[PDB]
Write an enzyme that holds these catalytic residues in place. Sequence first.
Site, PDB file in Angstrom:
ATOM      1  N   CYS A 211       0.872  -1.244   0.123  1.00 52.78           N
ATOM      2  CA  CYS A 211      -0.138  -0.068  -0.044  1.00 52.78           C
ATOM      3  C   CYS A 211       0.742   1.279  -0.037  1.00 52.78           C
ATOM      4  O   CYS A 211       1.695   1.495   0.902  1.00 52.78           O
ATOM      5  CB  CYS A 211      -0.874   0.033   1.207  1.00 52.78           C
ATOM      6  SG  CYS A 211      -2.033   1.364   1.286  1.00 52.78           S
TER       7      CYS A 211
ATOM      8  N   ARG B 176      -0.230   4.474   2.921  1.00 47.12           N
ATOM      9  CA  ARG B 176      -0.201   4.334   4.263  1.00 47.12           C
ATOM     10  C   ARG B 176       0.321   5.642   5.190  1.00 47.12           C
ATOM     11  O   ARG B 176       0.148   5.361   6.526  1.00 47.12           O
ATOM     12  CB  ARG B 176       0.904   3.190   4.624  1.00 47.12           C
ATOM     13  CG  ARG B 176       0.417   1.854   4.486  1.00 47.12           C
ATOM     14  CD  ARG B 176       1.484   0.904   4.591  1.00 47.12           C
ATOM     15  NE  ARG B 176       2.375   0.645   3.652  1.00 47.12           N
ATOM     16  CZ  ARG B 176       3.529  -0.028   3.522  1.00 47.12           C
ATOM     17  NH1 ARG B 176       3.876  -0.368   4.903  1.00 47.12           N
ATOM     18  NH2 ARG B 176       4.401   0.069   2.494  1.00 47.12           N
TER      19      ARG B 176
ATOM     20  N   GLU C 143      -4.341   3.901 -10.992  1.00 49.15           N
ATOM     21  CA  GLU C 143      -5.313   2.691 -10.779  1.00 49.15           C
ATOM     22  C   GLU C 143      -6.349   2.345 -11.805  1.00 49.15           C
ATOM     23  O   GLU C 143      -6.459   1.641 -12.401  1.00 49.15           O
ATOM     24  CB  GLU C 143      -5.743   2.585  -9.126  1.00 49.15           C
ATOM     25  CG  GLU C 143      -4.719   2.424  -8.169  1.00 49.15           C
ATOM     26  CD  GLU C 143      -5.369   2.249  -6.755  1.00 49.15           C
ATOM     27  OE1 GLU C 143      -5.905   1.366  -6.534  1.00 49.15           O
ATOM     28  OE2 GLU C 143      -5.652   3.479  -6.392  1.00 49.15           O
TER      29      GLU C 143
HETATM   30  C1  HEM Z   1      -6.665   6.279   1.717  1.00 46.93           C
HETATM   31  C2  HEM Z   1      -5.956   6.049   0.744  1.00 46.93           C
HETATM   32  C3  HEM Z   1      -5.189   4.777   0.168  1.00 46.93           C
HETATM   33  C4  HEM Z   1      -4.533   4.983  -1.007  1.00 46.93           C
HETATM   34  C5  HEM Z   1      -4.217   6.219  -1.798  1.00 46.93           C
HETATM   35  C6  HEM Z   1      -3.972   3.527  -1.123  1.00 46.93           C
HETATM   36  C7  HEM Z   1      -3.086   3.344  -2.326  1.00 46.93           C
HETATM   37  C8  HEM Z   1      -2.973   1.597  -2.805  1.00 46.93           C
HETATM   38  C9  HEM Z   1      -2.662   1.393  -3.898  1.00 46.93           C
HETATM   39  C10 HEM Z   1      -1.830   2.246  -5.187  1.00 46.93           C
HETATM   40  C11 HEM Z   1      -2.362  -0.136  -3.852  1.00 46.93           C
HETATM   41  C12 HEM Z   1      -2.433  -0.798  -5.198  1.00 46.93           C
HETATM   42  C13 HEM Z   1      -3.548  -1.452  -5.563  1.00 46.93           C
HETATM   43  C14 HEM Z   1      -3.618  -2.245  -6.820  1.00 46.93           C
HETATM   44  O1  HEM Z   1      -2.617  -2.245  -7.417  1.00 46.93           O
HETATM   45  O2  HEM Z   1      -4.528  -3.004  -6.763  1.00 46.93           O
HETATM   46  C15 HEM Z   1      -2.798  -0.518  -2.403  1.00 46.93           C
HETATM   47  C16 HEM Z   1      -2.821  -1.690  -2.035  1.00 46.93           C
HETATM   48  C17 HEM Z   1      -3.183  -2.053  -0.927  1.00 46.93           C
HETATM   49  N1  HEM Z   1      -3.527  -1.169   0.217  1.00 46.93           N
HETATM   50 FE1  HEM Z   1      -4.011   0.823   0.118  1.00 46.93          FE
HETATM   51  N2  HEM Z   1      -4.374   2.671  -0.232  1.00 46.93           N
HETATM   52  C18 HEM Z   1      -5.207   3.490   0.467  1.00 46.93           C
HETATM   53  C19 HEM Z   1      -6.007   2.920   1.645  1.00 46.93           C
HETATM   54  C20 HEM Z   1      -6.034   1.441   2.316  1.00 46.93           C
HETATM   55  C21 HEM Z   1      -6.604   1.341   3.557  1.00 46.93           C
HETATM   56  C22 HEM Z   1      -7.495   2.089   4.204  1.00 46.93           C
HETATM   57  C23 HEM Z   1      -6.026  -0.017   3.582  1.00 46.93           C
HETATM   58  C24 HEM Z   1      -6.436  -0.975   4.763  1.00 46.93           C
HETATM   59  C25 HEM Z   1      -7.016  -0.790   5.778  1.00 46.93           C
HETATM   60  C26 HEM Z   1      -5.226  -0.207   2.528  1.00 46.93           C
HETATM   61  C27 HEM Z   1      -4.434  -1.668   2.492  1.00 46.93           C
HETATM   62  C28 HEM Z   1      -3.718  -2.031   1.327  1.00 46.93           C
HETATM   63  C29 HEM Z   1      -3.683  -3.375   0.885  1.00 46.93           C
HETATM   64  C30 HEM Z   1      -3.756  -4.714   1.675  1.00 46.93           C
HETATM   65  C31 HEM Z   1      -3.230  -3.481  -0.355  1.00 46.93           C
HETATM   66  C32 HEM Z   1      -2.707  -4.830  -1.053  1.00 46.93           C
HETATM   67  C33 HEM Z   1      -4.001  -5.252  -1.709  1.00 46.93           C
HETATM   68  C34 HEM Z   1      -3.780  -6.193  -2.795  1.00 46.93           C
HETATM   69  O3  HEM Z   1      -2.806  -7.163  -2.584  1.00 46.93           O
HETATM   70  O4  HEM Z   1      -4.322  -6.423  -3.879  1.00 46.93           O
HETATM   71  N3  HEM Z   1      -5.111   0.835   1.680  1.00 46.93           N
HETATM   72  N4  HEM Z   1      -3.205   0.653  -1.903  1.00 46.93           N
HETATM   73  N1  LIG Z   2      -6.600   3.095  -3.243  1.00 51.33           N
HETATM   74  C1  LIG Z   2      -7.438   1.871  -3.188  1.00 51.33           C
HETATM   75  N2  LIG Z   2      -7.852   1.926  -2.035  1.00 51.33           N
HETATM   76  N3  LIG Z   2      -7.083   0.787  -3.786  1.00 51.33           N
HETATM   77  C2  LIG Z   2      -7.729  -0.405  -3.905  1.00 51.33           C
HETATM   78  C3  LIG Z   2      -7.622  -1.424  -4.935  1.00 51.33           C
HETATM   79  C4  LIG Z   2      -8.464  -0.991  -6.223  1.00 51.33           C
HETATM   80  C5  LIG Z   2      -7.886  -1.560  -7.549  1.00 51.33           C
HETATM   81  N4  LIG Z   2      -6.527  -0.988  -7.786  1.00 51.33           N
HETATM   82  C6  LIG Z   2      -8.802  -0.716  -8.748  1.00 51.33           C
HETATM   83  O1  LIG Z   2      -8.274   0.126  -9.314  1.00 51.33           O
HETATM   84  O2  LIG Z   2     -10.001  -1.141  -8.635  1.00 51.33           O
END
Ligand code: HEM
Ligand SMILES: NC(=[NH2+])NCCC[C@H](N)C(=O)O
Lengths: 409, 411
Positions: A108, A111, A285
């Site tokens: 992520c 974070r 994304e």
């Molecule tokens: C608030 C804004 C947030 C942003 C900008 C953000 C951004 C991202 C991005 C760019 C990815 C990659 C997504 C993909 O390629 O499918 C990612 C992955 C991930 N994020 Fe976030 N995130 C946010 C909030 C969250 C929250 C609230 C959580 C958990 C409570 C979280 C947990 C994770 C996890 C576990 C992954 C990996 C998911 C996977 O393996 O498909 N994220 N996030």
């Molecule tokens: N910024 C996020 N919370 N991403 C959660 C995964 C979403 C996914 N990469 C999409 O484009 O649909």
Amino acid sequence: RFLKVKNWETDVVLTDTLHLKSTLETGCTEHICMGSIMLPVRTKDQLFPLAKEFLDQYYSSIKRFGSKAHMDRLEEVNKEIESTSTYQLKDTELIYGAKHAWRNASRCVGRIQWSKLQVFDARDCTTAHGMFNYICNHVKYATNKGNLRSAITIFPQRTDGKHDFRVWNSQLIRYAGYKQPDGSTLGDPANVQFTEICIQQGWKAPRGRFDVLPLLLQANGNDPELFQIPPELVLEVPIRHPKFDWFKDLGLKWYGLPAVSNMLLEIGGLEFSACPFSGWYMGTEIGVRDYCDNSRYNILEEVAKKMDLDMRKTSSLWKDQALVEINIAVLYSFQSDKVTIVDHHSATESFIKHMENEYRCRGGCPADWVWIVPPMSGSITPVFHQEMLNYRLTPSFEYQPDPWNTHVW
Amino acid sequence: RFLKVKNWETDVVLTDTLHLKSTLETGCTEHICMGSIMLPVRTKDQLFPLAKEFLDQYYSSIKRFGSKAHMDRLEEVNKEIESTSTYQLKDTELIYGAKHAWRNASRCVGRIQWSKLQVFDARDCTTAHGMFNYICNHVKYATNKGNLRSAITIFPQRTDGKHDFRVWNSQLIRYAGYKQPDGSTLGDPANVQFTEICIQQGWKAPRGRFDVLPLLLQANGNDPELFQIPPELVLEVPIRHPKFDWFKDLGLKWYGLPAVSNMLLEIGGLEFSACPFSGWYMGTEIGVRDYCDNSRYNILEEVAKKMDLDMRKTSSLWKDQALVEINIAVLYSFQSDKVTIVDHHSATESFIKHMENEYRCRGGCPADWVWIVPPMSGSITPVFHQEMLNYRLTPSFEYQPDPWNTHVWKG
Ligand code: HEM
Ligand SMILES: NC(=[NH2+])NCCC[C@H](N)C(=O)O
Ligand code: HEM
Ligand SMILES: C[C@H](O)[C@H](O)C1=Nc2c(nc(N)[nH]c2=O)NC1
Ligand SMILES: C[C@H](O)[C@H](O)C1=Nc2c(nc(N)[nH]c2=O)NC1
Ligand SMILES: NC(=[NH2+])NCCC[C@H](N)C(=O)O
Ligand SMILES: [Zn+2]
């Protein structure tokens, strides 16, 4: 033992000790790196150590490591485990664990916002209808009329595995995918299979290019049920370019709330198989992956044509020119409708700051470079030049088999 | 233990058995991945085996494993090792060794060309002047008036560690970098330190934005000597855009021949510390990294102004728009001057075909995803969607410490 990571653009160097508290494996070995591979019930004996490890960090975080409260709790859980063969987290522990699972999500990039997570305790839930209710509330709370707020709703933990709660959708909100006679695919190819399982379950697909799928909720182990999200609750953004008026004609739009729902949250050995969470999109994304991936909406050529670009030779870089414009449009449409969204430049800059804070305040920050670097303009974002160390810390979010390959109806 | 890699775009799955022959380490453990970390004399005792593994691979490649020629060679080499503490490779083995180091280079996306390497045997070289002559012939051969040919020149192997041959330059051709008293940098910032060493050695710097550096050559462990590559031998390309007539006015140009010259080539345990090699450029190397890295020429803003882009807020993606243009310009300029160059789409598509071929005919293809995926437009190139396994096979190209850090000056 004490690893260092250097940023090659600034020469800054951080030392990593946090990895020393690493527990889980990485898929790699001293002989082979599997860093680019997407995917590299507990017993009483297995559990107590985990609970102990957790409570220790929890109490350590509240400045009460080795206090009576600490010892007491450790004993109560210990007792509860030996007796019930499991335990329950206090609300304080649940919140702390969820926030830290996000804190530890090495893939992520957002974070820096980890401590601001709103946690919805849905552990008292008992039916698919209850689940639908909790989910709608989560969706409304987090959408907040476009001013998105990060959140996670946590359903009952696993017991004997034959009473698991599971959200069958991969994201709370996603468009449907249907295989047409043409051989081609209508809608989102990624959800083609799920879209069919809804039908195989009764859903009445409007066979459109952007049909919001229905929730397929599974409670306490029983067979899943369908529920349509109140349309009034699904915020959407019409995609238009700030210069190409022909853009709108592409007939494109995307939803404003990204909400991963198929993962598993582990806290103190406890497993929460239904833990949908949401935040806000990073432009790329949608604009790069969902729209341009060859296996998704695959819209590059179409946009290429409309721009009248020499698609005869790859070296003209038409795909690159188009990709850019498309992504300028996504960020434009969202920003215009006042829906929260972040560009890859700003998002990566924040992650770097977050990494520095994490290094000095915690001794490290596990990060997966392969996922952190945006799918476009890689090296013109700071994370590209940043060495990263990936390792698994708990609490954590894990992958888990699709339910339809496990459900014993 | 078979290992599988999937291409999430084509659902194509490959099986890797080649990693079993991987001896060297990776820097990663069962608890940590260092996959994105830039940089994670032998005794008779340790040489014999390395030589044997190599000869075994060599003789198998020529379908003579177990033959009498194979057995005699092993006997000959071992006698020689115990006799002199080292051994000399036959010409055939050197060529085979050099080609395989390239074939095994996990960070190189151009490996589909690995078998067509021209090998120049400079093992009879004894002096820096001798090295200069070899290098000059290498550049002319490889440049081939713009129709580039991949090649490598191999100088004498290391013996006691005190008689090493080294090319102090990081590439045979590169532009000087000059730190200014006001803190700004003229030319290529990446080569400031080396430029300072050249000036200290006697080089008269013309102090411009694109001055070709002199060669600093070390033969047989002696102090390095300066040599200017004949200008007529250095092919350069003025950079212009196929639509923006003001682009040419940025005054940009780059050399046409990329020639890494600071790596170490290991073959059968022998160490070749001076082994300059060259191929042809992939556009993004110049257009993205050399021109747009903040720590290199850093031309994004200027190119952005001239395009009159909205640089008020990042979300306008002005950096992204300018990046594409600059890369179109690099590819266009080279193609017009008929100098070999390959775009990232073309290059990555070929690497995928090459990788697939390698799994099928060789059992695998060690590859570093972090380095293979281009620095721009990542996911719109097939490599991004391809899972890869990274491991070290020998022969191999290895990093080595900068010579100015280890050299015992003689005066
Ligand atoms: C608030 C804004 C947030 C942003 C900008 C953000 C951004 C991202 C991005 C760019 C990815 C990659 C997504 C993909 O390629 O499918 C990612 C992955 C991930 N994020 Fe976030 N995130 C946010 C909030 C969250 C929250 C609230 C959580 C958990 C409570 C979280 C947990 C994770 C996890 C576990 C992954 C990996 C998911 C996977 O393996 O498909 N994220 N996030
Ligand atoms: N910024 C996020 N919370 N991403 C959660 C995964 C979403 C996914 N990469 C999409 O484009 O649909
Ligand atoms: C035919 C043209 C070639 C192309 C298109 C090609 C392409 C590339 C590219 C794009 C990289 C990464 C460069 C960087 O980011 O600095 C690379 C790295 C590498 N290539 Fe090639 N290559 C070619 C020929 C060769 C040859 C002839 C050899 C060896 C005999 C070779 C050995 C390597 C090695 C060892 C690396 C890693 C260098 C490092 O760590 O800095 N390549 N190549
Ligand atoms: C094979 C490779 O792991 C896969 O194509 C990748 N997927 C992703 C990635 N990065 C992000 N953020 N999301 C992905 O799905 N990097 C590479
Ligand atoms: C830290 C990180 O490994 C570093 O910035 C990288 N450098 C390079 C890379 N890839 C290539 N081709 N060349 C590099 O110099 N990937 C990432
Ligand atoms: N394609 C090659 N042979 N590249 C060699 C490395 C050149 C280096 N990346 C540069 O931009 O100068
Ligand atoms: Zn690894």
